[PDB]
Amino acid sequence: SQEWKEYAKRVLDEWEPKTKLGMMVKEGQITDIHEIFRRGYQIKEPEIIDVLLPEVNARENQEVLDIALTVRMTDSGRRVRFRVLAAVGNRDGYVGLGIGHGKEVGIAIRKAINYAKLNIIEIKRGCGSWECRCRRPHSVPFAVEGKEGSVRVRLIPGPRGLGLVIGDVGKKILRLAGVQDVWSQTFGETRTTVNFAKAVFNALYNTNRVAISPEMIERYGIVVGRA
Amino acid sequence: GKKAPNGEFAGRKLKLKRKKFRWSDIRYKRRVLRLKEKSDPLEGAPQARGIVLEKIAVEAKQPNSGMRKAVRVQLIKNGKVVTAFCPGDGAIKFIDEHDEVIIEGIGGPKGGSMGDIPGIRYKVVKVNRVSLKELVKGRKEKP
Amino acid sequence: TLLDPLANALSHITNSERVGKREVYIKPASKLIGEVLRVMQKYGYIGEFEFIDDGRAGVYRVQLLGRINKAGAIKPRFPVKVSEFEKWEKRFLPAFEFGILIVSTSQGVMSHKEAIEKGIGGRLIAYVY
Amino acid sequence: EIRIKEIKENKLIGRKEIYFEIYHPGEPTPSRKDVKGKLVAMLDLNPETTVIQYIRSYFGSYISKGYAKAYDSKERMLYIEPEYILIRDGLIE
Amino acid sequence: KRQRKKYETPPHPWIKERLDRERVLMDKYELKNKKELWKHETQLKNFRRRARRLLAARGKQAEIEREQLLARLKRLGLLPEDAVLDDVLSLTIEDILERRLQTIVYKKGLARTMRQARQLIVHGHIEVNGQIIRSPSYLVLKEEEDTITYARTSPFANPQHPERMMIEKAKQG
Amino acid sequence: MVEMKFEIPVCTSCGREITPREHATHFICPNCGEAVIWRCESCRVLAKPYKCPNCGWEGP
RNA sequence: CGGCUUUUCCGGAGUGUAAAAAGCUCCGGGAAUAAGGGCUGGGCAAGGCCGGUGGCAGCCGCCGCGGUAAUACCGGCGGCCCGAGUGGUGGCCACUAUUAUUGGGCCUAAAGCGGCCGUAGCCGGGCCCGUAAGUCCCUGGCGAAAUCCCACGGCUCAACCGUGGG
């Protein structure tokens, strides 16, 4: 923890705020991460979030999902290009996904992680299974459906200690989302990793779309982000 | 429109439609009329005991180039004659003319010809009751 | 031609609230529609609902509170006893005890939660969450 | 060492059933004759009217169960009890 | 009717994460086969299934079975005496593993190693309440652990068996 | 562990909560000038009218 | 290198028969003394160097490998999965929402008949009254045993068996 605070202070020194959102996170009247989400500004500087959520920089909090090797081509050759899909996030309900183009492996990795940082979102969590009911945000609060491309994904709450029963892409995405047990159903082509990952991301984002009265906030221990 | 019929008193048609279209399936048709169990030369037998008649080889499908050894087996059970691929390195020499042999399906897609060699359906396991794999390894001896 | 007022009404409500209007008018008003409208309003899903004497079949006026996510009438009136009720909760609701269902028991149209303690079966009529 | 739990009298047969336990920690299983001469002492029975069928020693157990019968007259065994446990006890050649 | 296997194989023989998560426990607890670990996993899974079944049940038989389940879980020494139906979902494999006879007999300091304790058990040298068991996989109850001593007939019930002093020094060390 | 229970804003026109990356807006009341009026993206796109909580002024 | 017990291993003693054998149970002599199978390019990804053949020989469930460097054939070593098990093949379920009631599609990918009418069948407007067949709640008789779930108890435990509840 203290190392993360040290890194936060370091970047607070080095970074100079360009976008309007930079000042009040450098000046320090914003300390909550959810302050960014609630009002609905826009994020463009990668330094904005690691000040409040430096844990992204951990090697266990960042994951490289796939390394696609695409090919433009001309009369005088096939010019390759790297497209890397990778995810970052703290394990308390804040995750981002990114795709990075490049000409080398490392360049794509860097750009992908940087863009993933900008895709940070807030994840409601809970316990809505018919067998757990433990009021701890160990899983989704309710069953949700996400769509992207052809792929559709249904995430159903599951009991404690079951683990994530889902494809490895959703496995990693949810593991970085601070969720431990969920039933998964996948419709469409799941071989294309990118659409699957994006659909999982969109489902997690759609969790916040459901209207909730406080009674179920108590009933499932619904947490908006950090628990 | 809406998938039909959805009526509470529509059991007859809801059943008839499904039964009818289950015939559009091919695997179910293949089972219930048992025509796998009427076209089979092996009559649903994962093994059979046959006599060899002559050794033949076939050209691998392109771009695969080579010579795939095999033999021709008439079946003592019923009398049909089929090709029989022989595996192993230089194993054609081990399999001789007029040999009691044990033959078994080759486990390709749907039981079809395996991999890069066409037509064939079966491979040899035991020759004169002696397992061919060891004889490829030379551990045993043909009687 | 029209076949079922209730499912049309529930689809009307859902579609009208997806865009997010405020006052919704349902044309084919009947008694069962009113008995239905009682239930969820008793759970605070909708605001006021009232009946307007048109002169042909009556209209139903409802104010929408923006609470419902999906509200639809299960058509084929599945009769369900008590002890197996859970087998249908997994089919129409997003989570444990999220939302409700409407059953027409011997004692009238009324919410499913209130039927568990009343110990009455009946035929599923609609659902909302 | 042998210690009793069950001593039950069947008066339709006029015969005594004895269920007893033998403590044999660390030594080989006792034989039929030894326990036969052991019980008769402190139960004070006629040896010829007394017969044993089974003595079961369990796996990994130093305490073994055993059952014996104690009749009154020399004809009761010849009539009622089967012929094996006289031969196994030597009562019949 | 044909007697069925009591344990469940993993759905995939070659997943890295599951393989290594197995291997760490195999080296830690030193079981002969992954079959044993799978058996104990299934043993857990039975409790989990019973718990999740009962939690959604309304009826007298449901409650009665629930109380019986809680009672026998507590009897095994898995749970505290005031446990409820909600905490079983948080149980782990290691909670079962520590209750294994081999594990417990080692934690009594009666062996210098897991394998040494296993050898003593399988060679009929460890007694429970004066009874000998030759199965290190056995799971002990909460009312018998105090009876775990050396078998009387064993040479190691004798306090000067040459291995015994080394065992007790290791206990000291 | 402090549970920092934030107040997720709610739109005035419809009452729906505001998801993180929504393009919603927050602005001061048009007539009483003290009440904060939120407007969610769905409310914004079709521009359905909104009403003040304080003075009951109506404004798209 | 030093020490420890003997899984089995020879003898004796119980049971065993109504004949033993079973070697089931206890004691004594007592040696470290039984382990293979498959895989090693990827889909399986768990796992790499060398010798040999060089589009021949062969391997290969699918993708692929070899026209002289083969990390993919064969030999050696190394390594990997499982374990008195392990491989090949054939039949069945799932994988599959590729049988779609739950739960699929039919403009361009197989898939709306050129169009209309119309019988059976199916699906049908609102309100009141009656009936109560369906529908729902309660209750009597009844669906054998065996199998299945759980507690306890017996055989080391287990399996197995019984007592009790379902």
Curated annotation (Swiss-Prot), chain B:
InterPro entries: NA-bd_OB-fold (IPR012340), Ribosomal_uS12 (IPR006032), Ribosomal_uS12_arc (IPR022863), Ribosomal_uS12_euk/arc (IPR005680). One of its GO terms (biological process) is translation. GO terms for cellular component: small ribosomal subunit. Keywords: Ribonucleoprotein, Ribosomal protein, RNA-binding, rRNA-binding. It comes from the Archaea. CDD domains: Ribosomal_S23. GO terms for molecular function: rRNA binding; structural constituent of ribosome. Part of the 30S ribosomal subunit. Belongs to the universal ribosomal protein uS12 family. NCBIfam families: PRK04211.1, uS12_E_A. With S4 and S5 plays an important role in translational accuracy. Located at the interface of the 30S and 50S subunits. This is Small ribosomal subunit protein uS12. It comes from Pyrococcus furiosus (strain ATCC 43587 / DSM 3638 / JCM 8422 / Vc1).
Swiss-Prot record, chain C:
It comes from the Archaea. One of its GO terms (cellular component) is ribosome. InterPro entries: Ribosomal_uS8, Ribosomal_uS8_CS, Ribosomal_uS8_sf. Keywords: Ribonucleoprotein, Ribosomal protein, RNA-binding, rRNA-binding. Pfam families: Ribosomal_S8. One of its GO terms (molecular function) is structural constituent of ribosome. GO terms for biological process: translation. Disulfide bonds: none annotated. One of the primary rRNA binding proteins, it binds directly to 16S rRNA central domain where it helps coordinate assembly of the platform of the 30S subunit. NCBIfam families: PRK04034.1 (NF003115). Part of the 30S ribosomal subunit. Belongs to the universal ribosomal protein uS8 family. This is Small ribosomal subunit protein uS8.
UniProtKB/Swiss-Prot annotation, chain D:
Keywords: Ribonucleoprotein, Ribosomal protein, RNA-binding, rRNA-binding. InterPro entries: Nucleotide-bd_a/b_plait_sf (IPR012677), Ribosomal_eS24 (IPR001976), Ribosomal_eS24_CS (IPR018098), Ribosomal_uL23/eL15/eS24_sf (IPR012678). GO terms for biological process: translation. The keyword Transcription does not apply. One of its GO terms (molecular function) is rRNA binding. One of its GO terms (cellular component) is ribosome. SUPFAM superfamilies: Ribosomal proteins S24e, L23 and L15e (SSF54189). PROSITE patterns: RIBOSOMAL_S24E (PS00529). The keyword Electron transport does not apply. It comes from the Archaea. Belongs to the eukaryotic ribosomal protein eS24 family. PANTHER family: 40S RIBOSOMAL PROTEIN S24. May be present in 2 copies per 70S ribosome. Part of the 30S ribosomal subunit, where it binds 16S rRNA at its canonical site at the bse of the body, as well as a possible second 50S binding site near 23S rRNA helix 45. This is Small ribosomal subunit protein eS24.
From Swiss-Prot, chain E:
Keywords: Ribonucleoprotein, Ribosomal protein, RNA-binding, rRNA-binding. It comes from the Archaea. Pfam families: Ribosomal_S4 (PF00163), S4 (PF01479). SMART domains: Ribosomal_S4 (SM01390), S4 (SM00363). One of its GO terms (cellular component) is small ribosomal subunit. One of its GO terms (molecular function) is rRNA binding. GO terms for biological process: ribosomal small subunit biogenesis; translation. CDD domains: S4. Belongs to the universal ribosomal protein uS4 family. One of the primary rRNA binding proteins, it binds directly to 16S rRNA where it nucleates assembly of the body of the 30S subunit. Part of the 30S ribosomal subunit. Contacts protein S5. The interaction surface between S4 and S5 is involved in control of translational fidelity. HAMAP family: Ribosomal_uS4_A (MF_01306_A). This is Small ribosomal subunit protein uS4. The lineage of its organism: Archaea, Methanobacteriati, Methanobacteriota, Thermococci, Thermococcales.
